[PDB]
Amino acid sequence: LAQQSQGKALTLLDASEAQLDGAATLVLTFSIPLDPEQDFSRVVHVVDAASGSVDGAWELAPNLKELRLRHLEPERVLVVTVDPAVKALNNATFGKSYEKTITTRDVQPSVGFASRGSLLPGKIAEGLPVMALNVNHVDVNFFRVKPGSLASFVSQWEYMADLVYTGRFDLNPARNTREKLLLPLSDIKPLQQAGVYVAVMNSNAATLFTLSDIGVSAHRYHNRLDIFTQSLENGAAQSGIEIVLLNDKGQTLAQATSDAQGHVQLEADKAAALLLARKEEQTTLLDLTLPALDLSEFNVAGAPGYSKQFFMFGPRDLYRPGETVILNGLLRDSDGKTLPDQPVKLEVVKPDGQVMRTVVSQPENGLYRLNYPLDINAPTGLWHVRANTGDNLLRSWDFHVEDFMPERMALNLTAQKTPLAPADEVKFSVVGYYLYGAPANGNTLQGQLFLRPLRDAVAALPGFQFGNIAEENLSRSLDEVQLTLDKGGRGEVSAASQWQEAHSPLQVILQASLLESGGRPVTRRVEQAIWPADTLPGIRPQFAAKAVYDYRTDTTVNQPIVDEDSNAAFDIVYANAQGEKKAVSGLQVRLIRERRDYYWNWSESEGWQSQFDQKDLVEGEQTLDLNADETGKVSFPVEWGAYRLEVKAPNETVSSVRFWAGYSWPDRVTLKLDKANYRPGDTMKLHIAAPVAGKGYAMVESSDGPLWWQAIDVPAQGLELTIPVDKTWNRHDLYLSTLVVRPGDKSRSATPKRAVGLLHLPLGDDNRRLDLALESPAKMRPNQPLTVRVKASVKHGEMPKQINVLVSAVDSGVLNITDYATPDPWQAFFGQKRYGADIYDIYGQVIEGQGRLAALRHVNIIAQQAQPITLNEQGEGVVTLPIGDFNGELRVMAQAWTADDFGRGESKVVVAAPVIAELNMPRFLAGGDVSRLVLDVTNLTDRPQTLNIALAASGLLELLSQQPQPVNLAPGVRTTLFVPVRALEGFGEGEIQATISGLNLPGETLDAQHKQWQIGVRPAWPAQTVNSGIALAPGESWHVPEQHLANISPATLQGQLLLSGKPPLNLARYIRELKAYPYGCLEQTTSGLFPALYTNAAQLQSLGITGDSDEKRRAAVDIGISRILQMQRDNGGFALWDENGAEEPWLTAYAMDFLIRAGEQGYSVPPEAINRGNERLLRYLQDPGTMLIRYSDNTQASTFAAQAYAALVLARQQKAPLGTLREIWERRSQAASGLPLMQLGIALNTMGDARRGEEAITLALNTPRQDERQWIADYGSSLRDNALMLSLLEENNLRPDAQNALLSSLSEQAFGQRWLSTQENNALFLAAHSRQASAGAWQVQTSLEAQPLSGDKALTRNLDADQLAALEVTNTGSQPLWLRLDSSGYPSSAPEPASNVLQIERQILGTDGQRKSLSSLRSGELVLVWLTVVADRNVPDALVVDLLPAGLELENQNLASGSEVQNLLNQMQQADIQYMEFRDDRFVAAVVVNEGQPVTLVYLARAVTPGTYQLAQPQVESMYAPQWRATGASEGLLIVTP
């Protein structure tokens, strides 16, 4: 506002010092608010009359009248000056200069102990740190805690004593400066006597310290506690008693006395806070609630060591909404051996924490499997699969759900294929274009160049590596790329060579992103190979790469490794890019050993670091001569460690390959072992070395507790121990700990008294890994089975027995998104588990460690998993993987297991097509639309191609042009064909099939290329329906009313004829209308799900309905249940459109009702949802104030309805407090309908009080629904209420003579036709379902068949246009006949706009805000669609629908460059939008319409595919009073030009 300050000058009210936030602050207060823009420095300033300037940090309050300056040095003369300016907000300005002198006064005294104290003991323990400010002295009283009330006293602390005062310490700090001082206690004689003391002053006035000799160490486990008491003074070893206490409570949990070794063991979980160790008059305390010792610098990282190991894994961790998540599981013990068969409880968890599915997973041949179909609208984010094996230690397998947006543009980057000399510069050709056929003009290209080594430089020679792996400056970042492109699509990138010295093959990589408007770029990458010689050497090891762990990545990586002290063989070649193998003589072949000498190194910024110096030694040398077409084979003997084989040729070009001979590739206690890896029967030699000699103990332990331990005295020369390995040692979480302590409490040279050592105990085995060899071709073609041969090996011994293998194949990109590593079970079962104990200590706390190190370096996703196979006796097998289309790289993966052994295999397969064909088309089509499809064909072969393209249109789609002429494509060239098509009348899909003949390839015969695209086809106009019926007396005749035929086109005209000998109900119509409903709000989904629950296909076909093979139905119910769960709130309540939406109790009752019903029919629903739902219903019943019904007209009625429904739903479950039901029954007069009374009545009758139930029923049967149709939030009507009441009657076998009359009434009342709500349909379905109409005889003569139709049950029959156009019916029975005719089809003429209650209008603007014709639109043009809705009433259930023309596509943007446009937008920001959706063919929006308040909706849309498109009328209706409809005038057609 601030206008209220107008007319007022600017006077300074007060400049003074004041306390603010505990600090001395200079505050100026002016009369009126100032200019908040910080200009304070040249106008207002403070200057010390002695020290000059000071901090000028001028602060400004939330209030604008006060100017602040914080933190002023006390007792100083400040001169404050305000200059004539400051302006203020109303530019009133400060007249002239103002000067004021100030003295800043003194600060108030303060004293206190720096810390509340510690529990660390000392033999004398002097020095008490205190923070004193402006105080000359302090009096201190010293108490000694009574050994009796000691426990409770200390427990009062952290979560009753005598007095030994001395007091009066002389503290002389500088004036006005807080100083840190020490209170010495050495010269005090009545204090060095051991005990627990407390100092008190006269803000932390108290502190605690302890004098003692008992040094205490402790190792805690998840349910065990081991204590070691030794000497602080004379080395170590000590007896004495100790006890465990509670938090706050001084209650003793457990007690024990030290043995002759110092060791003690006590059973204790958490909630055991204070540890107390006593020996007569001596005492030492240890707080187990404080943080434990930091072991971040020790190699103690790894997975938890569970008793039962459950290895979960799959082909990937990145899925999209819609597709199915595949999960596999294997269960073993602590040493990877089989356990007795057992179930595992698996739960699916979506990002918000809510459970989506709960399955009791049973194994199948020892393999757990799970398939979770993600809903098409599933939330994006981090999902978990949560496994429970029985220990209630939840295992978690994370996986990502993400949705990817299309590209809508195309970028083409190409290079020169064949390698370049270092001198040459590198040229990349760029070609960008819009998908709809337009060239990308003036589009800015943003990329970057990179240089990398090229080791796989010859495709004709796989495995052979090239280049010196030790050559420097082969991996660096080159130039950035900014290219305006300019031309109609094309551009060029050029890279000058900074590489010359290179003796290895290189590749220069261009990675570039194409931009349309700085919104959603299209990125691509391309590489150019570079050789330092037309010919050069290549190396391929004869030995296979073995699988080994890599802690830097925590993934089991493949590495070239050979046995220690052995022979390494290699295949050498001398070759060129194309072809293979040339002649040469004098290849210099060296075996280089890479020696590394490690050493520790300390710094301030780093702490301690493990450094290492490297030296390359020549340990072998051969000389080789090669002929034409020869694979020279060399062999070098190796020993241990890292080697690399180097081959050099006379042209100074080098090629190197690194490998290993061993599978192994200061302020602490150094622990060393004689050998790496043991067995559970061997014996290990432990070398212990400490910086300073001392005493303590060594330990071998795990989780749960310790297995072995021995106290030790370590001299300053090291100490050697011998430890046996029991048979019970096989957990892989085994750690060897060591504690050493220096004798003296007081010592020079600093010296840390306590020192710790910690090492992982190797205990794995080298004969339990399945070595997997996956054999498959490096290249293949799409749409042909992928053959993968599995060959297993085990190094030592025989090829196990019955090796199970699970092979999979996934697009490498998807895997590369998440950096997904191929799962290995070996590392899962045998890998290094974490140190599962916490070390509490009394000696000085750890430094900080600084921390552990780290390492450093729409389309249908192809992702399959074959069934598990079993290898033969030789460990051989084969799997076939059907590959669909796809063009790129596949990572083939395999996990193998037996009962005891496990393994993992990787492989890579490049799927490439000789020619690629991409068909760009619109997102959908409407019947009659004419559209220009774009078919891009590109030849990827090395040869020129003459191709014959054959196109065919299937389904609701036809071609308009003649077949294409043959095309001549040069290698790498792309041609573009235009395919004009038209869509046919119908609701379905259209298919386009493309066939390419010719192609000519040497080496292959290759069948012709086939492709097929689908597109969705719907009618341009809403489906029209006509409903009529009549009663026929005997002899009476009837003919189809002309209304069923008028102005709607045949071949779209369906009919259903229902004949019955009793007042019928259109069951088929309800079912069909439910199944056809296209929107997925809660109530609609539920309502539509109800029929699929209680009706099988056998019952469906009787009503003239077919489809869904029942199992499909079950699947559909499951899907629906998921869709219901996806909208349950955190409180167990439900929402209408989304989980974050407002809560609606009635719907909660509804959805719950369906979920219980679904449970009853044998479907699976997670108990969390059921329970939270029931809790929410119970809270609806017991705490009605938690409710908040919106947009209601009678909150009482709403509340009552909700409570009644919830009452019934819980009553069905026998979970409804009767007292509450009665408490509600007393509020019956608030009921605005009979339905809640009925529901409540049933609940009462169910939970006991049958009387008040029957009363409630009888009352319901005489309580007409009453409301000026405002809302009530029950989603109801007279009709649906009557239906549901009849349903409740029929379901519980109550009043017959009433339900008969009401059934007839409902049959006749069901003529509120043409438009029913989903709720009404569901209600009517339930009423018709639970009905039993018994025997009702009828005979009839028709035009459908020569013979007469006859029956005793209501018969429904389908009719086509011909049967319906000429339908005649005549009753030939002895009794009356009820006849219903339901007709549906689409109009041959555009229907007239119509309105009722609601009004809808659509206008079309441009971005300039001016009206725009839908006939002059060019491709890529933007337009604003302006909808306006209005009504003379409050419609809280207004659903707006705007069918699109196929020429337009939506921009997904809510809230929506300037001007009058913004005047619309803002209005749209005033509308209360309950939901909004941007489909492929619709703009949908749920809104509430307020009386006399126009609702304004604007949305953005782009024109793309050129063509002539049908254009429908805007539509709006009330979802639950759908007689309130409006359609609003359309121009009829849309024209899009290129």
mmCIF file with all atom_site columns, C-alpha atoms in Angstrom, residues 47 57 84 240 304 374 429 568 575 622 624 729 756 880 901 966 1001 1087 1121 1133 1204 1218 1317 1337 1514:
data_model
loop_
_atom_site.group_PDB
_atom_site.id
_atom_site.type_symbol
_atom_site.label_atom_id
_atom_site.label_alt_id
_atom_site.label_comp_id
_atom_site.label_asym_id
_atom_site.label_entity_id
_atom_site.label_seq_id
_atom_site.pdbx_PDB_ins_code
_atom_site.Cartn_x
_atom_site.Cartn_y
_atom_site.Cartn_z
_atom_site.occupancy
_atom_site.B_iso_or_equiv
_atom_site.pdbx_formal_charge
_atom_site.auth_seq_id
_atom_site.auth_comp_id
_atom_site.auth_asym_id
_atom_site.auth_atom_id
_atom_site.pdbx_PDB_model_num
ATOM 1  C CA . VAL A 1 47   ? 32.006  7.258   12.630  1.00 0.00 ? 47   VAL A CA 1
ATOM 2  C CA . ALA A 1 57   ? 26.055  -3.249  7.308   1.00 0.00 ? 57   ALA A CA 1
ATOM 3  C CA . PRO A 1 84   ? 19.879  15.438  3.317   1.00 0.00 ? 84   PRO A CA 1
ATOM 4  C CA . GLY A 1 240  ? 35.813  -54.432 39.809  1.00 0.00 ? 240  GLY A CA 1
ATOM 5  C CA . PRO A 1 304  ? 24.446  -55.326 6.581   1.00 0.00 ? 304  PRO A CA 1
ATOM 6  C CA . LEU A 1 374  ? 2.600   -49.836 -13.279 1.00 0.00 ? 374  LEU A CA 1
ATOM 7  C CA . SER A 1 429  ? 28.021  -32.394 -41.011 1.00 0.00 ? 429  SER A CA 1
ATOM 8  C CA . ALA A 1 568  ? 50.019  -65.199 -20.084 1.00 0.00 ? 568  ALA A CA 1
ATOM 9  C CA . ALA A 1 575  ? 46.545  -54.228 -39.390 1.00 0.00 ? 575  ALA A CA 1
ATOM 10 C CA . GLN A 1 622  ? 60.466  -60.676 -27.331 1.00 0.00 ? 622  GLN A CA 1
ATOM 11 C CA . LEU A 1 624  ? 58.272  -60.768 -33.595 1.00 0.00 ? 624  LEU A CA 1
ATOM 12 C CA . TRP A 1 729  ? 33.039  -69.050 11.497  1.00 0.00 ? 729  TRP A CA 1
ATOM 13 C CA . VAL A 1 756  ? 42.489  -48.632 17.692  1.00 0.00 ? 756  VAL A CA 1
ATOM 14 C CA . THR A 1 880  ? 16.494  -67.468 -27.417 1.00 0.00 ? 880  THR A CA 1
ATOM 15 C CA . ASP A 1 901  ? 27.588  -71.411 -6.011  1.00 0.00 ? 901  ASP A CA 1
ATOM 16 C CA . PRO A 1 966  ? 11.219  -46.762 -56.606 1.00 0.00 ? 966  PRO A CA 1
ATOM 17 C CA . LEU A 1 1001 ? 23.448  -57.144 -49.634 1.00 0.00 ? 1001 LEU A CA 1
ATOM 18 C CA . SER A 1 1087 ? -18.729 -47.209 -10.409 1.00 0.00 ? 1087 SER A CA 1
ATOM 19 C CA . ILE A 1 1121 ? -7.853  -51.286 -7.689  1.00 0.00 ? 1121 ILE A CA 1
ATOM 20 C CA . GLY A 1 1133 ? -9.249  -40.792 3.132   1.00 0.00 ? 1133 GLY A CA 1
ATOM 21 C CA . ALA A 1 1204 ? -24.479 -43.246 7.363   1.00 0.00 ? 1204 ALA A CA 1
ATOM 22 C CA . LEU A 1 1218 ? -23.379 -49.376 17.928  1.00 0.00 ? 1218 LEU A CA 1
ATOM 23 C CA . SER A 1 1317 ? -24.610 -40.095 -14.198 1.00 0.00 ? 1317 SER A CA 1
ATOM 24 C CA . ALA A 1 1337 ? -43.530 -65.664 -19.639 1.00 0.00 ? 1337 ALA A CA 1
ATOM 25 C CA . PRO A 1 1514 ? -17.005 -27.352 -27.085 1.00 0.00 ? 1514 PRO A CA 1
#
